[PDB]
Amino acid sequence: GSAVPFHGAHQAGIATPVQDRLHFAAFDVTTEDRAAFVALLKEWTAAARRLTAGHAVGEGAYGGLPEAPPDDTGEALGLKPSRLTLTIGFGPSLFTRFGLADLRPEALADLPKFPGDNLDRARSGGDLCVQACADDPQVAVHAIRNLARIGFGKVVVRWSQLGFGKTSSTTPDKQTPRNLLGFKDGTRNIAGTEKDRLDRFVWAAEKDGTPWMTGGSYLVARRIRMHIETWDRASLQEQEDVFGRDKGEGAPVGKAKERDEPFLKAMKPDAHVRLAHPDSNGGATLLRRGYSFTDGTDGLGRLDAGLFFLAYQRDIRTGFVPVQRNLATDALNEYIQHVGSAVFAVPPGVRDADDWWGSTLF
Amino acid sequence: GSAVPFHGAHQAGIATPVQDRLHFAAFDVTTEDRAAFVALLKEWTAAARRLTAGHAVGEGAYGGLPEAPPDDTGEALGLKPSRLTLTIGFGPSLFTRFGLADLRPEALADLPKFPGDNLDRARSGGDLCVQACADDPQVAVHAIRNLARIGFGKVVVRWSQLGFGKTSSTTPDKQTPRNLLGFKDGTRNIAGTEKDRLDRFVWAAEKDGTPWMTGGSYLVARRIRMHIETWDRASLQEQEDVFGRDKGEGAPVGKAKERDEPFLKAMKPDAHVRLAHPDSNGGATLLRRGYSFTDGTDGLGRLDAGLFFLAYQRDIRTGFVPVQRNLATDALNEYIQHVGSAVFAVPPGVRDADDWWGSTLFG
Ligand code: HEM
Ligand code: HEM
Known about the structure:
Shape of chain A: globular
Oligomer: homodimer
Assembly: dimeric
Strand content of chain A: 15-25%
Chains A, B: Deferrochelatase
PDB class: oxidoreductase
Keywords: peroxidase, radiation damage, serial crystallography, oxidoreductase
Entry title: dtpaa chip experiment, ID29, X,Y spacing 25,100
Largest sheet of chain A: 6 strands, antiparallel
Helix content of chain A: 10-25%
Number of helices of chain A: 7
Bound molecules: protoporphyrin IX containing FE
Distance between the termini of chain A: 35 Å
Order of helices and strands of chain A: EHEEHEEHEHHHEEEHE
């Protein structure tokens, strides 16, 4: 139930232990006034400091003037901070505004088209994002709702995604969670304690060519539908062959324990783990941080199910792109479809109480 | 605690402690064969015994024949029972099948149309329901996904709703939860400890007219959207006047504490608490067991959020119907809309290891 510190060289919500619940929102900007947008970023930062400490925004949820709307909507009153993190990102489309064109980072690359893509344009893209993660869904909804309210008239919500349970791990010392296909997901990631690996693969550096992004990261989001009718009639052996790990323990094929190192040549040549592994991709390594979703039924008598895939990396061109390209022949492709996509530059951390989100850019 | 007993004179999930999370699904039946449906109820009951104890269904999620599909889909491996309850109910439309038309209870009444209703037919009705409540959402979802799989070919999923209340790891058991309008919700309700009130207002009795339903109850489900962005622009006074309680403490107007008994005459005539109170409705009293929802954002950028309202009662005609009728002029109507609806007869409990869901109806 404790608080995660909001200030630092980096934003929280990346290397932080993965929280139980997600509420992700993408926003489009509706003001042409640079000074007004800067004022919004400062007001959002002030609200974020309150929210992540478990306090109400502005002057509170009640006990003000009877004839005014309360500053805070009130539904988180009496709740603990619940490890709430709030992480902001800027999309490529932002840089066509406020005279920012020459500040767009090279590492913020547009993704190519990938075979099998079926992307809904309405639930793709966005000028900016806020990732809210917490152990309590009410706390996460409250944060997004209050940020959107403060932003009324300057930003609108383009699309949002809720995740009911995590399918990722930055804490190898704890139980690895399972996705809706029934497999552990998160065994070989990057842990929050692995400072050298974070510096090499996740955090942007001054020498990479964009000074304002030093200490930031780049985010890829993919909404992926799962064909669970098709999967649930597959044999156990089929399922295990798809991944290269057994279902019960999640060990590499032939080995006894989850965390034993994979021996790739024992897996099928189209196994997911074999294709995705850094040794198959010139060393390319990702920080995965996704969540499961279900949005009702599909109208054809079945539950809807999917995974909202989130990856952080130092450069989209050397992280997600080469790995996803290598997944063109993945056995898993028979059971999934990518139906939404977005990329964001995640700026550096808020250094102290006088700093603000985006201050290095603006 | 960690598990809730499955067997009893009553089904669990009604009077048992309220769990943190909900997965509610409505199913339609596709078979005409009574024998095949009975066989399904028996297999579903066997699965539910396993699920509510934290075990996998059938022969398990792994370690069987490699060339067969696993009996359990495996996404709950490693999780705890999480106080899972599974509660089954039968809709009015079931009784048009299997020769059951003369066994439909009179208390399972069709709802009238109410002012302001805007019901989505696709998210309404259903032949059957399963209410899955648990502290971990993945335990609830795993239960619904596996029941649906076992039934494939005999039932389909018509509609499904996820919901949330409190998070018990961080929030005290005695604290009333707040709804998404920011008000405490549940202060004046029937509690699971109130045996006599449950017998008066919730459980069906033999003398009520339908012997097979003795020890069962009747459920009304309403999916109620909130107009969040409109509500959030209302003044504090306007919000408090809508309910007849204050927002911070949740006390009735002119009182000091949440649990002080209301004085109805101090509230505005169309305040929600005044219209809903038993004294305004000839003594009519409900067990509310609903959950908040947030599904996403709609095409206009607004939050798709609200209350998935669940009420249990001894007779729909003397519980939900009179009370909802009395809300025709509710000040709250400006900020909500009922967009889905269904009613179910929830049979008596599974008595022991040889009993099965629906045995009093089917024989
Ligand atoms: C619904 C989609 C997906 C499912 C169900 C899935 C499932 C899994 C599972 C079960 C593992 C093995 C346990 C682990 O080490 O985490 C794994 C590993 C991995 N996945 Fe995926 N995955 C999906 C999509 C993706 C995508 C889109 C990418 C990247 C483009 C990706 C990259 C990886 C990586 C890098 C590993 C670690 C390989 C290693 O170093 O051993 N996955 N995935
Ligand atoms: C979005 C919809 C609704 C909201 C936000 C809401 C909110 C509330 C609140 C805040 C209270 C006062 C605290 C408490 O005693 O629980 C209350 C009481 C109550 N509500 Fe509602 N309610 C809603 C819909 C309904 C419906 C549809 C019914 C019945 C048909 C209902 C019946 C009652 C009853 C019986 C009480 C208790 C009155 C008493 O005995 O003091 N509510 N509701």
